[PDB]
Design a protein around this ligand. Sequence first.
Ligand SMILES: NC(=O)c1ccc[n+]([C@@H]2O[C@H](COP(=O)([O-])OP(=O)(O)OC[C@H]3O[C@@H](n4cnc5c(N)ncnc54)[C@H](O)[C@@H]3O)[C@@H](O)[C@H]2O)c1
Ligand SMILES: NC(=O)c1ccc[n+]([C@@H]2O[C@H](COP(=O)([O-])OP(=O)(O)OC[C@H]3O[C@@H](n4cnc5c(N)ncnc54)[C@H](O)[C@@H]3O)[C@@H](O)[C@H]2O)c1
Ligand SMILES: NC(=O)c1ccc[n+]([C@@H]2O[C@H](COP(=O)([O-])OP(=O)(O)OC[C@H]3O[C@@H](n4cnc5c(N)ncnc54)[C@H](O)[C@@H]3O)[C@@H](O)[C@H]2O)c1
Ligand SMILES: NC(=O)c1ccc[n+]([C@@H]2O[C@H](COP(=O)([O-])OP(=O)(O)OC[C@H]3O[C@@H](n4cnc5c(N)ncnc54)[C@H](O)[C@@H]3O)[C@@H](O)[C@H]2O)c1
Lengths: 358, 358, 358, 358
Amino acid sequence: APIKVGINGFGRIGRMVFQAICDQGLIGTEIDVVAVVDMSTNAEYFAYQMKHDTVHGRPKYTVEAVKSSPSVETADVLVVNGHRIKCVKAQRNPADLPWGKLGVDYVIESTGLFTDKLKAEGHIKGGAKKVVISAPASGGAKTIVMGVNQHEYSPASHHVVSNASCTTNCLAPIVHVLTKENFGIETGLMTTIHSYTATQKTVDGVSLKDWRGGRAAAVNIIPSTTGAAKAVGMVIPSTKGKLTGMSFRVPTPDVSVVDLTFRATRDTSIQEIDKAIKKAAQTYMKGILGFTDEELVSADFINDNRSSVYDSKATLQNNLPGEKRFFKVVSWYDNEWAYSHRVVDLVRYMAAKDAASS
Amino acid sequence: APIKVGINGFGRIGRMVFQAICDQGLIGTEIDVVAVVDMSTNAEYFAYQMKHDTVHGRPKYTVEAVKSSPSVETADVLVVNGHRIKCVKAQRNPADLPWGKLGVDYVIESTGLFTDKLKAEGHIKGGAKKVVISAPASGGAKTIVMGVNQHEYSPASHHVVSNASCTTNCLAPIVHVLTKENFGIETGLMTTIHSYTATQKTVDGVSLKDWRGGRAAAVNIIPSTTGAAKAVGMVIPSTKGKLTGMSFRVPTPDVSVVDLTFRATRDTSIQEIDKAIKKAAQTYMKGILGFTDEELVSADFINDNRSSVYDSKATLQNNLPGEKRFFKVVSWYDNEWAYSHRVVDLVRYMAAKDAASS
Amino acid sequence: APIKVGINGFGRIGRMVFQAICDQGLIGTEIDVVAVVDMSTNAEYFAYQMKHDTVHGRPKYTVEAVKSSPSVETADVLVVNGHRIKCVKAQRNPADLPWGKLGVDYVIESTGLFTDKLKAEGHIKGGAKKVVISAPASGGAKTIVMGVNQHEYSPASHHVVSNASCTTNCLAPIVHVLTKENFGIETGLMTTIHSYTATQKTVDGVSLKDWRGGRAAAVNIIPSTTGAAKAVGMVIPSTKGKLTGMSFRVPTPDVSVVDLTFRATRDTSIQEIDKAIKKAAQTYMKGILGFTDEELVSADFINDNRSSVYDSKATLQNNLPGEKRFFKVVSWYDNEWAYSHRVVDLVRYMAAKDAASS
Amino acid sequence: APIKVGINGFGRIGRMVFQAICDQGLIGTEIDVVAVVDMSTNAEYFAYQMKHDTVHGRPKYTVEAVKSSPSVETADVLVVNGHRIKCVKAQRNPADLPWGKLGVDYVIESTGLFTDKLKAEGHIKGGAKKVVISAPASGGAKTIVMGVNQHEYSPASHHVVSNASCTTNCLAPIVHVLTKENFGIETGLMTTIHSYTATQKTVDGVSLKDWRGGRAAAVNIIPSTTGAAKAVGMVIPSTKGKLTGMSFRVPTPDVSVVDLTFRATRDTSIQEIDKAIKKAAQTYMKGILGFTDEELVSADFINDNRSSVYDSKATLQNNLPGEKRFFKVVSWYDNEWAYSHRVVDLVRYMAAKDAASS
Ligand SMILES: NC(=O)c1ccc[n+]([C@@H]2O[C@H](COP(=O)([O-])OP(=O)(O)OC[C@H]3O[C@@H](n4cnc5c(N)ncnc54)[C@H](O)[C@@H]3O)[C@@H](O)[C@H]2O)c1
Ligand SMILES: NC(=O)c1ccc[n+]([C@@H]2O[C@H](COP(=O)([O-])OP(=O)(O)OC[C@H]3O[C@@H](n4cnc5c(N)ncnc54)[C@H](O)[C@@H]3O)[C@@H](O)[C@H]2O)c1
Ligand SMILES: NC(=O)c1ccc[n+]([C@@H]2O[C@H](COP(=O)([O-])OP(=O)(O)OC[C@H]3O[C@@H](n4cnc5c(N)ncnc54)[C@H](O)[C@@H]3O)[C@@H](O)[C@H]2O)c1
Ligand SMILES: NC(=O)c1ccc[n+]([C@@H]2O[C@H](COP(=O)([O-])OP(=O)(O)OC[C@H]3O[C@@H](n4cnc5c(N)ncnc54)[C@H](O)[C@@H]3O)[C@@H](O)[C@H]2O)c1
């Protein structure tokens, strides 16, 4: 049966998720997008935001704005590839949303305002079965990183899942093969050269939380922080307290790169690792972890759905020749595309386990 | 006596105005800044916002954050060059501000949220005498462009004045000498290649008012609009309905250029105009209209306080050889700096006429 | 028969031209790319430059680098969609290139070094029949703007044709319908907000020719000049001396916009013009002049092969209400993509008239 | 006596060095700039490149272009603060320059074309005593990093000295106090988020050496390489083969940051290190190694002459809580300013040891 879904917050991640749904052909049959929600309800504005994107270009599907009853002035229904989607008005509280009435089982929380498990439980109280937070969730919700611990999902216990962060969906896959392939990680520190996002400012403005983050985004190298720092251990408990890091926000609208440095448990080599990541990429991590033997730059990873695509050359060429412990692993990721495709995956998977149980 | 002022909205224009006051040595003596208003009241954050600016660098003055009564945890008093300034908490309504209590006579409206005359009158109802709106004001407020019609100010009638816009303070001066020098403007269209502002987005987000204006700021040439379009006529009524224009927002954090194209009333030449603008610049428009014979680019105008600086070479070289009517006149302006300096001028000038009358 | 062509200068325009030949399916059959010429002859580097483009993404075709005789160390033959293309070594003089030997009849001059008719005649001296310069050529070569005067081509007289410039290929079609639709242009001045190009500098460096043009490309609004200023008249002789303009280079890697201002010969309205351009777009200018009724920004025109795509909303919204003469017409163009498509068009059309005659 | 010096390659580093000379007041008395060398000899163009700098603003001095004998058309002499400097024409070979004639003893090699000890010896063969290469020199010249091993200079042996690279002048001071304070570095890997330079392209062009490095500078995150990789060991031999790294070039015109991760020889803490670097900064490294306790971003470091300015907050905040070995140290530096100030320092100190001996 079509998985009944709703999108709360039709932003970068909101629209990229919807796009991954329509482009993989899932829309209408496999998955069913009932209603999207944002500040306005002008299906016309939504139609425009969908047809033209600065970084990803025009979507493969076809969208139209139609007003339901001719009495309403502004259009309020998107018609994507023969399928009516409703434009619901934004609520300050999740529990105010007409999910249950609408017939929405899986709510995708991507407004970014409700990262808390409790604040996000409101969707359930609004009539929804499950909720997938598009960011590191607080209040102890279940953090899952596809390709690493999706199996740990519990149809009975877990009703408010978190798909971690973009950096997390990049680092965790790597940390996974590293332990699984027995190279092990004693202590590690990582940095992510990150594209700027919606939360940064075009010009020096206010950001009471992070002082630096409020500076002119596209004009400075802004040291900041990463979700992946915390989130990594909640997926791979083995690394808890043994891994930490930061992020440098730089003047690029999309695509980021993880720069991991770690110490192995056993003596090994960079070729050994390089070989195991490529192998892992072609075997058990296929579709999640990929790699590259080319001299690529950031722009070359735009629209690349792999959670993390390891850089062969970059890594091999920048490690100590005589070394068996202290290593560096470079890996890229398109932070809006890959992550979004991982959210659709989680949904569909959660729906599979939900069909078995509840 | 020290003019009693307060700043509502300590942003780009907020902070540049306060800076123009300290840097011109006006702080404490000539002008007296009682309190600054913004989202937070942490003078420590304000301190930081003041000492490091991406585009204008470090201010000449000295700022410190001090908590008045040791009972308050976060500092709440700025000490700029030996002077206590209070950090007032932001109000949803202007009339809620403690102006009258604080002892503030002149309110500077720069939150951008109250461009309406009536929404702005609230400051008077809050205990303030006069109010200067740092943008084109609606509700029929008094629009004044220093160097063009400041004399028209009325201490009795006018209580909510508008300092026009940055593009207005650049176009108006030129339009003034064009008329005053008897060249006359029949019909005219203008474009302004403008740097982006706090109102634009880093990535493709929401902008319900102007659809294009919500696109990635630092990654596109975004056709938009300019305040100067309307505001120009409200200062030089002679041009009402005979002049209009647009603006292209481009990937630069500050400094813009006006590209005016018009038709003269009488036959004339580009040299005639070139000469008249230079003369005007050295005589009656000094300090407001300036000019350049150098091969400059945008960066060269940062921190230049002239409302408008005519570009001699770009103009002379880019006009028809055999022509007596159809002309082009290019001119630059640092939209955050010069405009801010004009705001202070308006206040001080207003305070002068208010000392004569009321 | 397959048109025998070779490209001199495999750069932005060089590579986009080759791409337009492969993507339209013309490669191998309709057109035959014999050899490409650049600094190096490493087919491997060529293949890399071909497979990853910052602004236009990965091409549709497939490319491989193969060394001909196993005796040569570096590969020297590209294999695009089953077709051997040779990597010729760059020559300081065109006449030194082995065109005639290789079997190349049509040379595409895109190094940027030989814009002179005489410097360009060298290819003929080197064994080539016809030469198309991808820029405004000097020495009085034949300037042609597809959709405007290609018919003026003379297989007997014209052997070194110039495809004008990108700005010329966007302004010309507009000027064409304005005259053909009898609106007439008395006097006109135009500005083009243009993306930066290979001739600009990342940081302040040398540009002995144009002083401003040597400044930090991606950080300033650099007043400069346009080829279209002169070239327009060499295509539409009727406008000679009646039109001129400048260009502002801005921080965007691709896609530019023309901002024309003119005075009509007869009284008319903006809607009349608007209607005529859309009509012209659907009729006799189809494929060359196009238009848009959407609220688009620069990124939205990437990969748009129309020589010029008129902006209806921007035009209609930014003109004087009571106006019958003084108008503004905004139009976009992808300076690398559209223009490159026009060069392939010119070649194939020239080959058609050359088959009739010589 | 005034040190006789000449600049070869009046570029970013060329002009910044000359500026450090004029601004520190050294021009004319302490140091004597005899002539500057570049592509052109037009003192007027030079005047222009000196008066307006995109990133550093207008220099404090005063420059003028004057033609010596009224017979020469273009000016050929710069008059900086009362002092005639000659504009010599660029030579393909160093040994062809008129150093000996001119009366130049110390040549500053900054064209970037002669990093080889042997290629640079040509200056001596041209009549010059000593030569300082503004970049890691090959051919085994003497690599000196002020504040780390300048004392190792030998007025007798060393005649072609190399001032290392910008990143090197940033990492070395840090590696110095790390060993000097007995924290010891077992194995280390570093990354530098670096601003783009004059060797990168505005748009996807040719760069046969580094494939990635030829991609659009201001639009990508380009993994590349750093000089400091090798150079570090040639200054602190104790680290040879124990330290290596890479650089990620990002869309910023100036100011970079080093991100070092290493393993200590002995158990220790981040606070210990933090303490030792601030201490060292206030004692034996003063003027070379500085630090900051503020929430700074890239633009804050522009015009900061310290070779390396440690970031206290970024480091303290981003290290493992329970950790005695695996650490991270973040440090900024203005790659054009600081480094240039180190070149002037090296010269004058070389001059000191040369007055003692030869
Ligand atoms: N951009 C990335 O690289 C990325 C990647 C992975 C995860 N995320 C995370 O997922 C979340 C999505 O953020 P984003 O970067 O897409 O920003 P965004 O601003 O594009 O998305 C937020 C959307 O929520 C809307 N919104 C605000 N309040 C709402 C409400 N009450 N109800 C409904 N909609 C509301 C906003 O208008 C906006 O369109 C963030 O927390 C972000 O950290 C972002
Ligand atoms: N920067 C320019 O180029 C420029 C030029 C001319 C005029 N202006 C005009 O001045 C205004 C502001 O421009 P800006 O660049 O300063 O914008 P900004 O975003 O920098 O200013 C808004 C500031 O006011 C604060 N604020 C919002 N609501 C507030 C409230 N209710 N009370 C107190 N503070 C509040 C915001 O937090 C922020 O600090 C607009 O009207 C704008 O047109 C700006
Ligand atoms: N990109 C645009 O905006 C654009 C648009 C219209 C017209 N044009 C014109 O097209 C031409 C191509 O320009 P571009 O922007 O592609 O520049 P580009 O710098 O990317 O292309 C020039 C290429 O020519 C190569 N080259 C130089 N000398 C050579 C020689 N002797 N032999 C062989 N190859 C040589 C260079 O190595 C470089 O690869 C220029 O004349 C330009 O004015 C460019
Ligand atoms: N820019 C930095 O961050 C930085 C940091 C450390 C070291 N340096 C070194 O400075 C060196 C020069 O780089 P830059 O950043 O000044 O670049 P630049 O290209 O701006 O300056 C080099 C200059 O040399 C001139 N030149 C070239 N060939 C010449 C020749 N044959 N004769 C005379 N003059 C010639 C050029 O015209 C140019 O002006 C590089 O090796 C670089 O590594 C620069």
